[PDB]
Amino acid sequence: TPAAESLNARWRTAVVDGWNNAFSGRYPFKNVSSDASLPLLAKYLNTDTGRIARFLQNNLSGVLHREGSRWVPDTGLTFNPAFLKAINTLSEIADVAFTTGNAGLHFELRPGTAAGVMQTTLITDNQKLIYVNQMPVWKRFTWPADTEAPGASLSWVSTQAGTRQYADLPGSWGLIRLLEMARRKAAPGVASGWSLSWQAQDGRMLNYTLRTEAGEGPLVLLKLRNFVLPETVFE
Amino acid sequence: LTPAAESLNARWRTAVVDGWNNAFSGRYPFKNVSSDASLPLLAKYLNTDTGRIARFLQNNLSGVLHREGSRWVPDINTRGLTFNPAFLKAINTLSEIADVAFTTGNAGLHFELRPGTAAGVMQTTLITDNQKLIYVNQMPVWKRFTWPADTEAPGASLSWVSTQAGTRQYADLPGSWGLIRLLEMARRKAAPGVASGWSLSWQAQDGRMLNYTLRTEAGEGPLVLLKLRNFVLPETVFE
Ligand SMILES: [Zn+2]
Ligand SMILES: [Zn+2]
Ligand SMILES: [Zn+2]
Ligand SMILES: [Zn+2]
Known part of the structure; x- marks a missing residue:
């Protein structure tokens, strides 16, 4: 649907473009000497205040819901399975390593x-x-x-x-x-x-x-x- | 004190104290007021090893002051050079807070x-x-x-x-x-x-x-x- 396609463009502008600029060619994403910035990673994956969580709250509240730390789709709008795997991986990392709003x-x-x-x-x-x-x-x-x-x-x-x-x-x-x-x-x-x-x-x-x-x-x-x-x- | 002691005090105010007071004057917990101090900014000042205060101590006072665990101790006692007792008490209070609440380099x-x-x-x-x-x-x-x-x-x-x-x-x-x-x-x-x-x-x-x-x-x-x-x-x- 046109609403779905406008949401995909917003996802890249608000989140993905900046994520790739921050983390391209950085450890742990790649086995390289240059290190990803932990404060920048917190700004993206923080459970409640992170850029990804805010995007999910502002755009997907009616189709995706929190279930503890998990993100579960509410039972022309079908999720990309890679998107669901990715946000679930990041929510698990945030629940373990970013509880205070910073790495720790x-x-x-x-x-x-x-x-x-x-x-x-x-x-x-x-x-x-x-x-x-x-x-x-x-x-x-x-x-x-x-x-x-x-x-x-x-x-x-x-x-x-x-x-x-x-x-x-x-x-x-x-x-x-x-x-x-x-x-x-x-x-x-x-x-x-x-x-x-x-x-x-x-x-x-x-x-x-x-x-x-x-x-x-x-x-x-x-x-x-x-x-x-x-x-x-x-x- | 002497001109060398006065120059160091002036450097301490320019590098640390001026910024500390701009960030934290009239802010909770320093004062019992509605406006809150910034926790990330507080970490940038009091972090045990990487904070603005620790770096000033390392860059300017390494010959007269040293670490004993989390504590800061005068060596230093070079002739006619004496620490302000309030300065020693203050850095030791901040060191204790950093050891309990800022171990990761941020509040937590x-x-x-x-x-x-x-x-x-x-x-x-x-x-x-x-x-x-x-x-x-x-x-x-x-x-x-x-x-x-x-x-x-x-x-x-x-x-x-x-x-x-x-x-x-x-x-x-x-x-x-x-x-x-x-x-x-x-x-x-x-x-x-x-x-x-x-x-x-x-x-x-x-x-x-x-x-x-x-x-x-x-x-x-x-x-x-x-x-x-x-x-x-x-x-x-x-x-
Ligand atoms: Zn929450
Ligand atoms: Zn513990
Ligand atoms: Zn009180
Ligand atoms: Zn240390």
Whole structure:
């Protein structure tokens, strides 16, 4: 219908044009060195005040409704399935990582053990976890955390060598780039838990368990890899 | 002090204090007024490592002042050079607030509330940034809240139902600081046998108490923002 087509043009002018100008050729969308701006991303995907949420409220209130964090179509106006997938992916990321109106989440890590590993050191935005042999406990982390030098790093001591660096990933997305490198799987019998494993250069495993406050915690940001904001709302 | 101390004080006012006062004079929480201070602008000044104040300290005072965790300590005591004690107290108050409420580089913290009971109170409704807690004297549970929480209409409110009347409003405080304005009104004391807990009580207009227990993640949680009430950023670093 003409109303549907005018809405598609408005969606590009009000939202998509600016989204692509901000995030083209930026990590996490692409595996590149240049980082997406977290405050700019918040301005687009904030749950209630973001540019996308406001567009949905101002133009689609009668055909699309919130169901907690989900966006559900109200039972020549058929939605582009890519548009529905995209807004649902962004609403899930906003619910986990942008609750305060800016990027910010908490999670906990518990260090694990591995044959031949004497020590592990994981750092994110100057929050350090050194594990040698203390009783393993859950350490709370914040992402992002205010620092002059943001980034994440991981190191280990083996039975064959002194301290070695697995990776040093600078920038506000350092933690996310590091998580992208881990082997990840559901933790057996751990509520909202994931077993993380980084295979170090000597073949040894650097093991941790991740526990979140909600959903996938920081792993949710990986849903932005190769993410495309559709240019159309209706088919 | 000496010409070097005076030049540094002048740089402190040009780089930091002039802008701080332009942003925050006659704004809540600094003054008990209707106009609200900007939370993103406040973060740009007091962020622990990246804030305008922290950067001034790093760029101009690295040889006479250093960090000890979240704290700022004089080394410094170079001959005839002495800090204004109000300057040291002020940066340490801001450091404490930043450590509790600005860990992500923007305003943001979590806390939990558990509702309590009072004679003649049949319901209480507490709302902050559209997060609602309705209590009707059943088995009490903890509810998690975030401040700020993204919403089109920020603010906080509290209402109650009593034996003498239906729903009454205790307060409706709009704006990003609504929760803080509401917490300011409560009687507060350490909770008996609750780790990092405070018992909060609002004395409603009918004389009945609207009781809650607050549990925080770190320090005073949202109560730390009350340290900004009547806060003055000193115009001088050195005497
Ligand atoms: Zn937390
Ligand atoms: Zn720091
Ligand atoms: Zn909402
Ligand atoms: Zn007061």
